[PDB]
Design a protein around this ligand. Sequence first.
Ligand SMILES: [Zn+2]
Ligand SMILES: [Zn+2]
Lengths: 464, 464
Amino acid sequence: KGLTPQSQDFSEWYLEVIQKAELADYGPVRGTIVVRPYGYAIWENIQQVLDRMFKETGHQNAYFPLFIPMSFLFSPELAVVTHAGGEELEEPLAVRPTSETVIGYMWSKWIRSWRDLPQLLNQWGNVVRWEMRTRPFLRTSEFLWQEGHTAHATREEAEEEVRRMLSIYARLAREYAAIPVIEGLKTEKEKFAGAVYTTTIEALMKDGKALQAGTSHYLGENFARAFDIKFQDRDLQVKYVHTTSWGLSWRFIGAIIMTHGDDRGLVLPPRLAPIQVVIVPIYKDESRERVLEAAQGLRQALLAQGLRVHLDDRDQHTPGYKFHEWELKGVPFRVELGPKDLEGGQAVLASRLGGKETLPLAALPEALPGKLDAFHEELYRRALAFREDHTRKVDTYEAFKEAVQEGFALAFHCGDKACERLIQEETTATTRCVPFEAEPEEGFCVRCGRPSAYGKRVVFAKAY
Amino acid sequence: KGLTPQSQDFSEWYLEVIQKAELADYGPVRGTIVVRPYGYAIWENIQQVLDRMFKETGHQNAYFPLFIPMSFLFSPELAVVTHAGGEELEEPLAVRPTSETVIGYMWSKWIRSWRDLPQLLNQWGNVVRWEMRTRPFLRTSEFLWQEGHTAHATREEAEEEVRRMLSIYARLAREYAAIPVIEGLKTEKEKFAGAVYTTTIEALMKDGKALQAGTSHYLGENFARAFDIKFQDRDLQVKYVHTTSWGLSWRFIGAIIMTHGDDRGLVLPPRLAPIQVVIVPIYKDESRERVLEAAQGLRQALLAQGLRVHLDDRDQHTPGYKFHEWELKGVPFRVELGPKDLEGGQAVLASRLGGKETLPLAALPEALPGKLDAFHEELYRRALAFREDHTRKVDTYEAFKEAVQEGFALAFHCGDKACERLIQEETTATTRCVPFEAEPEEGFCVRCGRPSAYGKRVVFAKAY
Ligand SMILES: [Zn+2]
Ligand SMILES: [Zn+2]
């Protein structure tokens, strides 16, 4: 049964492609998924890219415990261990929803003077925050992610870190996933309760809904006061540190799926694709030797170019099967190398985006790199256009209701939480972010008509 | 004050070095630890090396859920979740002690014919096996590791996979950690219960006790039958798959500490050491510019050589302090770069293995790589010498009791589980493995006297 078209039922389309492209599958325990190889490889590329960016910026990876003192934290989001070692634990243990509490404790003892700062920490791994609504890569009790935490001697240095990390996520989205995003502040209502403020990158999925792709919080001294994290400054005065926190999960994979995916399956951005180019040799007993030899030569030639190429010479499947599979899995480029074309020293180069062409094998190594970039460029261009066509300035609550039905709605807002929640209660739409950079404007709240706040229009939308 | 000497109290020396070298610290939960950046970096290196080796052999990474249905398995080793989402669960969940059961379940559905074979999976991550003791990188309820799982169409292909992965573990040990190991089979008593047989690599620590560094099991059809994992072969006949299993945890880090460490602290193998060379610039105000410029020049030159070099320009610590820290942390080489020697175009190269030599700065970059290799070779050589000195062939149960007090005891054994458990109850020593490459010998059980089995002497020792 072919893939349900996006125009017919996006939600179902989403669930089916994750299944058909073999990204994930449902685990025995309700609410849990099994991330398959192909899907995991996408997460690995995302991790490698972020890790380099984190490292170049001084952060270091560490590993805080999976089990957290219940005393240090009953709460619906927690999965609690009550039995272990063949007995009831006098002290039940919570599975970490995040490592912040343990981090705060360790920082309390590790940080003593300005010499101990900054503290630039990151951790890759799983966390658990119980969820009733199951949905692959979007909402699951357990998921993988990366959460960073930093401590600084001054406020300035911390706020700079906050933006530094958000820009890293924005770069990941733009330069690597070709996903357009808006950088800005969450409103008081939408921010993390414990942060002075929360910055975010908001993306628009092909179904017109918004998805938060990354977050970076400025915690001020809130976290430091809570865990008694202080240091002796150069002026001998004892002060609390200024901290930040930022995370990005495999929800990003969902963002990639719903941003570039089409009715034929996945379309992965070249710079995060586990396989940028797949070679599918076609032959018969007679032409086996010649074809595979040429297929392998091309494989090496592409590897030498630093490209992630895969030679699918599997005997357990037919060419028709392979082509269909690699299409579903969104491989940017496919190379059909058959006996006939091979005589002419050529092969067929197909683009997941559409179109094919016969070219000489020798020219392929030198051309693919530029083509991959072009492929990336096209994905971004198309995504930008979609966003443009699905973003609308609104001055009336009537036009607002129409706008949040198709995508982004740029509207004035009074800045009142109550007015903001009312809009959500009536339209289900939420404020996604007050962008850092946008046309400066002054007006009146799209809902209550009172003077507009923020000095610009706020981005609203129905969100994931 | 120094570290408790190894000969004074090995165990206390162990805990102290981990603490002092900042490999790990203690978390709020009695039993949970925190792996610091320097300690984590070692694991990251082990992971990269193993990952490359698994990848080149066709394996692929995946991610199975943390929680497993209790029905798939309260055994004291298990940590059980009975409360989640603010409510008490009807079906108690187990935190994975291994993903084997969920993998078996998924394979049951994914595997249908020969086209789905072979299955070559691996997973990096945490698992939990309750431990009352708490020794970082040796015995902890929660730990990180890698566990591989494969499904094959034939017994021959499965058994080959088993030895392929053991050899990979042996290569990591020998070629990367400079840790000598003995490859062999576990006895029936020591093998994994659900396995036809268990292979392993056994290392000897500096305290004369043996340590299982890694294992690879041939599960035959036991696993397939238990989880109903079968396939339609080319001959249209439905058959059970043959599976293998293999794992290696950061316990491997403890092996490194106890194999090469000394009274001065850690001694990291060059090929796994986060920092292979550390540059310590010594200077004054009038020579600060010249030195640092020379240091940075050497830094770059070494990086250009592909070496993991670190420049410790921290001006808040005396050169002595630095020398001590990098020695404690086991950095292979330390370059002392000062005013006087620099004028001569030279610097002092200090080896963690002992000794110094003044060499021309210009020749260093080209020489270090080869020196690191010799350093590695020396580490291995010493460990081999140690093993030879702590290994002894015994023909009497008297000589056996002496040998297993110092290290390895090469004795004949009848092969009876009963006799084997007796030797353990009487000496605490266990069989480590029946070595693959062991001189063929026939004799009589070192304890009961009955005719010897295995056609060779069995390795015995007190073990971790
Ligand atoms: Zn209003
Ligand atoms: Zn016996």
